[PDB]
From Swiss-Prot, chain A:
<dbReference type="GO" id="GO:0005739">
    <property type="term" value="C:mitochondrion"/>
</dbReference>
<dbReference type="GO" id="GO:0045259">
    <property type="term" value="C:proton-transporting ATP synthase complex"/>
</dbReference>
<comment type="subunit">
    <text>F-type ATPases have 2 components, CF(1) - the catalytic core - and CF(0) - the membrane proton channel. In yeast, the dimeric form of ATP synthase consists of 17 polypeptides: alpha, beta, gamma, delta, epsilon, 4 (B), 5 (OSCP), 6 (A), 8, 9 (C), d, E (Tim11), f, g, h, i/j and k.</text>
</comment>
<keyword id="KW-0813">Transport</keyword>
<dbReference type="GO" id="GO:0005743">
    <property type="term" value="C:mitochondrial inner membrane"/>
</dbReference>
Swiss-Prot record, chain B:
<protein>
    <recommendedName>
        <fullName>ATP synthase subunit epsilon, mitochondrial</fullName>
    </recommendedName>
</protein>
<keyword id="KW-0066">ATP synthesis</keyword>
<keyword id="KW-0597">Phosphoprotein</keyword>
<feature type="modified residue" description="Phosphothreonine">
    <location>
        <position position="51"/>
    </location>
</feature>
<keyword id="KW-0496">Mitochondrion</keyword>
Swiss-Prot record, chain J:
<comment type="function">
    <text>Mitochondrial membrane ATP synthase (F(1)F(0) ATP synthase or Complex V) produces ATP from ADP in the presence of a proton gradient across the membrane which is generated by electron transport complexes of the respiratory chain. F-type ATPases consist of two structural domains, F(1) - containing the extramembraneous catalytic core, and F(0) - containing the membrane proton channel, linked together by a central stalk and a peripheral stalk. During catalysis, ATP synthesis in the catalytic domain of F(1) is coupled via a rotary mechanism of the central stalk subunits to proton translocation.</text>
</comment>
<comment type="subunit">
    <text>F-type ATPases have 2 components, CF(1) - the catalytic core - and CF(0) - the membrane proton channel. In yeast, the dimeric form of ATP synthase consists of 17 polypeptides: alpha, beta, gamma, delta, epsilon, 4 (B), 5 (OSCP), 6 (A), 8, 9 (C), d, E (Tim11), f, g, h, i/j and k.</text>
</comment>
<protein>
    <recommendedName>
        <fullName>ATP synthase subunit 4, mitochondrial</fullName>
    </recommendedName>
</protein>
<comment type="similarity">
    <text>Belongs to the eukaryotic ATPase B chain family.</text>
</comment>
Curated annotation (Swiss-Prot), chain M:
<keyword id="KW-0406">Ion transport</keyword>
<protein>
    <recommendedName>
        <fullName>ATP synthase subunit J, mitochondrial</fullName>
    </recommendedName>
</protein>
<keyword id="KW-0066">ATP synthesis</keyword>
<comment type="similarity">
    <text>Belongs to the ATPase j subunit family.</text>
</comment>
<keyword id="KW-0138">CF(0)</keyword>
Amino acid sequence: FYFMNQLTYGFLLMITLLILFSQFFLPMILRLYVSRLFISK
Amino acid sequence: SAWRKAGISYAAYLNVAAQAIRSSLKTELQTASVLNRSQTDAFYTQYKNGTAASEPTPI
Amino acid sequence: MQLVLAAKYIGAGISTIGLLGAGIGIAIVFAALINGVSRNPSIKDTVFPMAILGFALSEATGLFCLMVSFLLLF
Amino acid sequence: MQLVLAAKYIGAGISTIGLLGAGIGIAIVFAALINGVSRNPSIKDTVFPMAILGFALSEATGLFCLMVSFLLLF
Amino acid sequence: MQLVLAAKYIGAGISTIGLLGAGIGIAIVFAALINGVSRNPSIKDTVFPMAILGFALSEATGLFCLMVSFLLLFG
Amino acid sequence: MQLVLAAKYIGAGISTIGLLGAGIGIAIVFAALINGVSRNPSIKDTVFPMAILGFALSEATGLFCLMVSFLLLF
Amino acid sequence: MQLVLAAKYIGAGISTIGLLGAGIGIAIVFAALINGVSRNPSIKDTVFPMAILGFALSEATGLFCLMVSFLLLF
Amino acid sequence: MQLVLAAKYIGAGISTIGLLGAGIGIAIVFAALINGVSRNPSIKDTVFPMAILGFALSEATGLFCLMVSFLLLF
Amino acid sequence: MQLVLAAKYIGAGISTIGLLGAGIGIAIVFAALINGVSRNPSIKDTVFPMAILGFALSEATGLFCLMVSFLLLF
Amino acid sequence: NDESILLLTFLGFTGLVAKYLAPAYKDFADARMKKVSDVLNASRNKHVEAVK
Amino acid sequence: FSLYTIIVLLVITSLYTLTNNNNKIIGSRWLISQEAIYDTIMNMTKGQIGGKNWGLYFPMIFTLFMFIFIANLISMIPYSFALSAHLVFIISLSIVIWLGNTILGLYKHGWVFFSLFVPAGTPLPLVPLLVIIETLSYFARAISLGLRLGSNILAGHLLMVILAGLTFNFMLINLFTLVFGFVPLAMILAIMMLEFAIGIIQGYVWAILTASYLKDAVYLH
Amino acid sequence: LQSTLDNIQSARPFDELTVDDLTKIKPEIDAKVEEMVKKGKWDVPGYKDRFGNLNVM
Amino acid sequence: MLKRFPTPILKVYWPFFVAGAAVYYGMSKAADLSSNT
Amino acid sequence: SSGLKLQFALPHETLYSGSEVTQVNLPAKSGRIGVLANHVPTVEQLLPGVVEVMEGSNSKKFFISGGFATVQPDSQLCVTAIEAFPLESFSQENIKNLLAEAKKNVSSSDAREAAEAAIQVEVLENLQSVLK
């Protein structure tokens, strides 16, 4: 039932995904899209 | 049966069905309307941009 | 001591029960081929040659079940 | 000599089930046969050959249980 | 030997009933092939790659059940 | 402990019987895909997604069906 | 405890059989879903989400069968 | 003394197989439902409640099978 | 006295499995309900009571198999 | 060795990918690049014509 | 296992940070590999949870989507990174997602959330049965999410492992050095292409199921 | 207007244009990102109608 | 290049954080009770 | 509505238009369909054959040469038709058989004409069966 390095570390890492990606990556993909929109008008 | 694939079209299906019904009947049933149905003279012609009449082939 | 051969024998017998897949398989594919040819008389020459490939594929499951049964017989 | 023969009989008895394949074979094969001839009366000389081939190849794998069962019964 | 090998061979015999699904699956795969292609012939070029995907995956699951039987028949 | 592992092997086998449902399901979802595109060509680019999801779910049924086999086996 | 655990394992192995119906049916639900969405391209918005809820409730039966299989095992 | 519990487990495992019956029930109910709601979107609010009661009673049969499985085990 | 109740539980389970027929049947007739009422909603009250009186005893088929199971149990 | 067959198989799928998936994906990706380029030039054309 | 989970963090952090040469608008050769998946995600999310608050409740479904699909991707390397053959994290976070949508429904609706287990119109003599019919399925679909992904990924990992271990006499002593004796390698390669396919499709379908449960949570049906 | 046309057509290629150049040229795009992030609408109408959606799946 | 954007951190994921706390509590309580190892 | 309002129409002489009728058995595309009252709405082509119309009168055989099985939800079935069929005057064998044999003899034309000849042969066989 040893889950210290399998559950806690993975859980913290997935917080890192949920926070860092939604702060940086999908926002700058949408920034690419909206910049293309802006130059296209 | 195969009007859509092998036959001409569905309209040809009605055409052949009506022709069979009218022609394959009694002698007294061949009235004036049946005579008009049997007689076909639709000479369709394929025009073009320059009105090039291909041919007035019978229907 | 003879239980090994005995169990081999019931295993092969129930492994012949793998033949139902192939049986009802041949059944449905041939029947649907019949229906398709009935709907389009001019499509038989384009359906049968491809159908042979799937007939080989559906005999494949039959002979697979047959040979796993045979491994338990000989 | 006793449990081996018992297993032989058990295996034959359970393996002779595999003719459900032939049963459903004939089932849907002449189901499609009848459907095709009823919907396409002109299309008979085409449906019938594929129909009898379907019967033959379905019953082949259906009775490929029966003949091993005979090999297993005896 | 004895009951352990007897049970191994019994499992080898039983595991093949899963091939019922694989066989009937490839069967209805080609039944759908034949019916759809009979509905119209122009769709054959669009259905054939999905057709090959379909029957390849059906004997893929057939392969899955046969190698589980293969492992079950051996040590 | 011999019969315990013996019954483990039997449990694994009777568990992996249950992938035949997966085998039917994958084929039937792809079957729906193909006749849907066949009756009208323009729907394929929308129908293919849920067809491959039909595969995913139908196989997943078999995988978690014989997961208890693997746990039984291992 | 030997035959007790053996029969518990056999019970789990048979309990997992309770999902053949789930395996084929949670596929046929999406199969008919995509057939219907091919019948009308534009009904997807209202035929999809309730199809997914029916999916969850149709995977539920296999869900309880694996739950009782786990109870047999654990 | 112990094979009594063994038979309890076997009976529960064979009892929980009625779940796939409810799975087929509810699944084919949903498949028919969306097949019949794809045509005539307007016929939705009258096919909703009776669909609800139908898969409810199918799942009721399945859950009664689960309940007798639990009773045999517990 | 021991295998007595062991086989009693075995029989109760192999009787509880008999719910598949009711489970599939109530839903297949109900699928007929769905497609028929989609074909014409004007005669919904004509096809509804016959359906109720039919699948009520379709579940009663279950009820008889459950009575057999309970007599096999208690 | 079990670890011998695995590395050879992975080399096999890498070769298969480069043979089949890489070219088709390359064409699709380059088509999307080209589409983005032409819509950018269309935006420039609209801007310059409006200014004209 | 901890160092192996950091690897997938590094690979997908480099998806954009180590890709854009100058952050060009045209997009680099690996920026496209993520904007295409972003486009697919936004498309079927607005398809399934379409309406209000879909944008506010898109990002965590997205995060789960990349989590799972690169988690399936790393299961192709021969020393397969299938969660180090433990895969219980999928179950734990499936239970986490179930608690999340339960709290979503309990806060958005409250007492109305109990009406999520009963549809809009039911017969009076039959509602008390159908409520308990629809409840236990809902509480039960908290392991169904986990066993799906677990099933596919680790089933693949152990079947390649089993096939490789079973491949002992194929070319060393066996005289059949053809495909007849190389059936192990052939079905290994076939099942690996199958594994890649089922991994990507199962990531997409689990995105669908999680979006469906979120739709059931924030809305009422 | 003449200067605008001249520097529109004579230079400034677009394929190699970087997003940072657009951000430094005009900052209202950043404000737009703030406003549709806070309102939580990531699908404002007029996003990919004139561009490539390429919805593969 | 790297942009630190103000995005919802817990305004929409807070029930997920409660679920994570619950699973932490379950793992901690099952490390000796339900572990059986 | 009670019964059906059959609208049997022809390009030359219509037969019925909103007339009470009990059974309107008509040769559907697949087979023939029996219509009694408030039938399910449907649209489907009709192959040539007897359109059995039960009304207050005696047995009335109405062979059709083409039409649709168009039924309204309000039981106002409208069987379109092209050629009428007298109960006894139309039934003749000599001319029908002679025309069938002649068409079979001249059925060896090109494929475009061959399909028409085959369909004419099948409809002539249908007429022969209808003759009874």
